[PDB]
């Protein structure tokens, strides 16, 4: 399952029962962005680290949006 | 030995268990990591005194303590407990004004951004948290004592003490972990030219929050993304009722004028440049004046030239056919 998750917008292969802190520790292997610093939004919703894709209805071709952590 | 005490070891104040102790080695080599009365002792050697007095455990969990653990807190990490017993003692410094009956957290140690959290959630009606340890603490902090809930929320949103952090993304961590205690539906209309048309049902909190606009007229605009087929999908809301509105966004400066009767009714600000550390404040709007919570300071203006994030708006009756 091919997503988007727009920064420019790039491409992950997961899979629906990957958790959003796998998502991001792809994010940083790519990007170089820290987990912890990473806030990826998808339908207006903050996706918290301990949930999976499936949860949020996350499937094919979706784009989720990233947002750095302010101050930090 | 020398002497042997009896101390009782909770990890919920409600379950007890009796551990033996002596004053031959610490509590940390003997029981583990031991908060007495909100402080660490833990390196200290067991006196005569504490014997039959209580102490919370940190690690070195039993079983059971370890199964209550996750009913009371849900599933949390191994360091949760300690850092949110340091938490807990380290935010005791911290006060908690009441201007006109509205509590505002004074600023101290880069916590401006929790002032903006917590009197975000207090404008919020009906919403109750799921996880018991973060409910029991959210009617304390709602009966005047904010302590538990306060070091809870930095727990749980992985803050340090003295260090600033995002008010927004610790709002939203905080916010799902509640839930509404009335109606909120939010109807979106979705289509792509080769697959069709399909209605997609949003209920209760989820409902009331959307993280990437400000307005109500950017929430209810089309929206383009990609379908599962590979083309262009397309997505609009149709049907909103609610009993608030929360909409947050990156940092936006505007204009907010009360000679323009505004339909919001509170938003955040976040003061300074994004790559540097800014200042939260949080605003209210009574009076037709704009009340600004500058973490223990009060203000009044009626116009404000300022960079916006969280907007909260009265509830909604919204009906589309798109
Ligand atoms: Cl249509
Ligand atoms: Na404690
Ligand atoms: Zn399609």
Redesign the pocket.
Request: glycine residues 0%; hydrophobic residues 50%; charged residues 25%.
């Given at each position: 399952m091919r997503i988007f998750v727009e920064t420019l917008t790039i491409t992950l292969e997961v899979e629906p029962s990957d958790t959003i802190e796998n998502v991001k520790a792809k994010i940083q292997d790519k990007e170089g962005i820290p987990p912890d610093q990473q806030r990826l939004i998808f339908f207006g919703q903050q996706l918290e680290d301990g949930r999976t894709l499936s949860d949020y209805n996350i499937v094919k071709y979706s784009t989720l949006h990233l947002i750095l952590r302010l101050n930090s | 030995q020398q002497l042997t005490i009896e101390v009782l070891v909770t990890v919920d104040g409600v379950n007890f268990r009796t551990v033996v102790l002596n004053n031959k080695n610490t509590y940390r080599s003997q029981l583990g990591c031991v908060f007495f009365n909100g402080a660490d002792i833990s390196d200290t050697i067991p006196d005569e005194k504490q014997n039959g007095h209580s102490l919370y455990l940190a690690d070195n969990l039993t079983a059971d303590e370890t199964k209550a653990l996750k009913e009371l807190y849900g599933p949390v990490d191994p360091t949760f407990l300690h850092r949110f017993y340091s938490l807990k003692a380290a935010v005791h410094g911290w006060k908690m004004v009441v201007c006109d009956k509205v509590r505002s957290l004074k600023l101290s140690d880069n916590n401006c951004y929790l002032n903006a959290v917590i009197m975000t959630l207090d404008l919020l009606k009906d919403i109750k948290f799921v996880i018991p340890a973060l409910q029991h603490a959210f009617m304390k902090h709602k009966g005047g004592d904010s302590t538990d809930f306060i070091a809870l929320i930095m727990a749980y949103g992985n803050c340090t003490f003295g260090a600033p952090d995002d008010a927004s993304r610790l709002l939203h961590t905080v916010l799902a972990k509640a839930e509404l205690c009335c109606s909120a539906r939010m109807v979106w209309?979705e289509?792509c030219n080769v697959c069709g048309?399909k209605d997609v049902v949003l209920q209760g909190l989820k409902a009331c929050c959307y993280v990437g606009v400000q307005t109500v007229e950017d929430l209810r605009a089309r929206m383009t993304y990609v379908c599962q087929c590979g083309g262009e999908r397309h997505r609009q809301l149709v049907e909103h009722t609610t009993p608030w509105l929360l909409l947050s966004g990156t940092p936006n400066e505007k204009l907010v004028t009360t000679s323009t009767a505004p339909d919001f009714v509170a938003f955040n600000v976040f003061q300074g440049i994004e790559t540097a550390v800014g200042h939260y404040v949080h605003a209210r709007l009574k009076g037709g004046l704009i009340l600004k919570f500058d973490s223990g300071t009060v203000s009044k203006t009626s116009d404000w030239k300022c960079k916006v994030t969280d907007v909260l708006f009265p509830g909604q009756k919204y009906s589309s056919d798109?």
């Open positions: - | 209309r289509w048309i798109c």
